[PDB]
């Protein structure tokens, strides 16, 4: 149907916007602490601590399959990256600190993304 196509164009355009959001958030992680999944070879107990691991590469795979239906779903995954790290790692660590700085800097980007998603529809 023509409606299904229109919906698909909306999803494509959301994907375009979330791709730009993802690039902007990942620039706020210049150390690449959050770039890839925590290695279960190197942290074998990880899944005992963290039930829903997340990282920027995993989000990008979902994004490119157009697997984010709305901004809320995308923000959920970004919040998992931060929150997982802040639980597994102690306050005094470069990992925790990196997550705090990514949360604070990402807030700005996400605030305007929300306006753009509502604005453009």
**CA atoms in the 13 A half-sphere facing the CB of 68:** 27
Q: Say how many residues make up the chain.
A: 121
Residues 36, 55: contact at Cβ < 8 Å?
yes
Q: What is the DSSP letter of 44?
A: T
Contact 77, 60 (CB under 8 A): no
Cα separations (Å) of 9 from 16, 46, 58, 62? 10, 39, 23, 17
Listed resolution, Å: 1.5
Domains defined for the chain, CATH in brackets: 1-121 (1.20.920.10)
Q: Coil, strand or helix: which one is 35?
A: coil
Q: How is residue 101 written in tokens?
A: 């700085």
Residues with Cβ within 8 Å of 113's Cβ and at least 6 positions away in sequence, in order, are: 17, 18, 21, 71
Q: How far apart (Å, rounded) are the C-alpha atoms in residues 2 and 75?
A: 30
Contact assessment for residue 56 and residue 81, using Cβ atoms and an 8 Å cutoff: yes
């Amino acid at each position: 149907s023509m409606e299904q196509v229109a919906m698909e164009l909306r999803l494509t355009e959301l994907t375009r916007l979330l791709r730009s959001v993802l690039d902007q958030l990942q620039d706020k992680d210049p150390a690449r602490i959050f770039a890839q999944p925590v290695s279960l070879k190197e942290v074998p107990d990880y899944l005992d601590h963290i039930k829903h691991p997340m990282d920027f590469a995993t989000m990008r795979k979902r994004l490119e399959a157009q697997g984010y239906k709305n901004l809320h779903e995308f923000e959920e995954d970004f919040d998992l990256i931060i929150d997982n790290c802040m639980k597994y790692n102690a306050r005094d660590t470069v990992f925790y600190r990196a997550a705090v700085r990514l949360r604070d800097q990402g807030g700005v980007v996400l605030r305007q993304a929300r306006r753009e998603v509502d604005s453009i529809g």
